Design a protein around this ligand. Structure first.
Ligand SMILES: Nc1ncnc2c1ncn2[C@@H]1O[C@H](COP(=O)(O)OC(=O)CCCC[C@@H]2SC[C@@H]3NC(=O)N[C@@H]32)[C@@H](O)[C@H]1O
Length: 259
């Protein structure tokens, strides 16, 4: 932790940039900032001021007031995660269901760390060995969605959440955050393209990495309510379809427990 903090090199923005260039990337802007309250908040604020955030990438070394979903938090220490948000214009034509972007983002994270090391837990989680390796948050601000990823690279669970894990804690020796980050951006770009095009590979690939689909689950709803059943599928809006004795309960978000 003290030990870890002293062995976490900064990102090399110029090298991230070079990788996007060499690759002919369609990302329109890439910035790394030392610290911010929330990258998601930052891109939403740009959009709100009339900036075109489509294809804008914002990476923060440190994030001091991270957002989870529905009012929960996201914790970090400096240089220990890849903390990034991207803008996506969603009002195209033929309009696709923006609820799939968060799923596409998880998928891209898992594909980016596959070379080094389990799967996607709906709605927001990337798990490895049952621990939370990454969290995904998509926020709509028509005509945009801001899509956020917190990926634990060397972050220790004692620094952020007892149920967290990281690439380092999974046994990856000296993870190269630059190379992972560049790979992540390549895969996010690829999945957003599939999403726009209504390409079926997206949902097929998500299924192939899904921990939730096919599981006995409890869906937990406000008011201490719950519904227990089988996570039958994810629908074309990105929502979980729970089979309860033949009847379908479709939930758009919120908490899901694998039993
Ligand atoms: N670093 C971490 N690693 C694993 N778990 C964590 C964590 N920090 C917090 N947690 C736990 O995970 C919960 C939140 O999980 P949820 O499913 O609600 O929420 C999520 O998993 C979505 C997390 C989104 C983070 C990215 S970072 C870049 C962008 N900017 C932001 O401000 N947010 C996005 C917290 O209540 C903690 O229990």
């Amino acid at each position: 932790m003290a030990d870890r903090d002293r062995l976490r090199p900064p990102l090399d923005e110029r090298s991230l940039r070079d990788q996007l260039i060499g690759a002919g990337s369609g990302w329109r802007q890439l910035d790394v900032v030392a610290q911010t309250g929330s990258t998601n908040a930052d891109l939403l604020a740009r959009a709100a001021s009339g900036a075109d955030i489509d294809g804008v990438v914002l990476i923060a070394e440190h994030q001091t007031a991270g957002r989870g979903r529905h009012g929960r938090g996201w914790a970090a220490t400096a240089r220990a995660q890849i903390i990034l948000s991207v803008g996506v214009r969603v009002v195209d034509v033929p309009v696709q269901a923006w609820g799939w972007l968060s799923l596409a983002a998880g998928l891209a994270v898992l594909d980016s760390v596959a070379p080094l090391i389990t799967g996607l837990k709906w709605p927001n989680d990337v798990l490895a060995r049952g621990g939370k390796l990454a969290g995904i948050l998509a926020e709509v601000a028509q005509p945009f969605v801001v899509l956020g990823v917190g990926l634990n690279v060397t972050q220790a669970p004692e620094e952020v959440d007892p149920d967290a894990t990281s690439l380092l804690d999974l046994g990856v020796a000296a993870p190269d955050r630059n190379r992972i980050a560049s790979r992540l951006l390549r895969e996010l770009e690829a999945r957003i393209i599939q999403w726009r095009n209504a390409n079926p590979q997206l949902a097929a690939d998500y299924r192939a990495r899904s921990l939730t689909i096919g599981s006995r689950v409890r869906v937990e709803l406000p008011g201490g309510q719950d519904v227990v059943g089988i996570a039958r599928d994810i629908d074309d809006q990105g929502r979980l379809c729970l089979d309860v004795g033949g009847r379908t309960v479709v939930v758009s978000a919120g908490d899901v427990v694998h039993l």
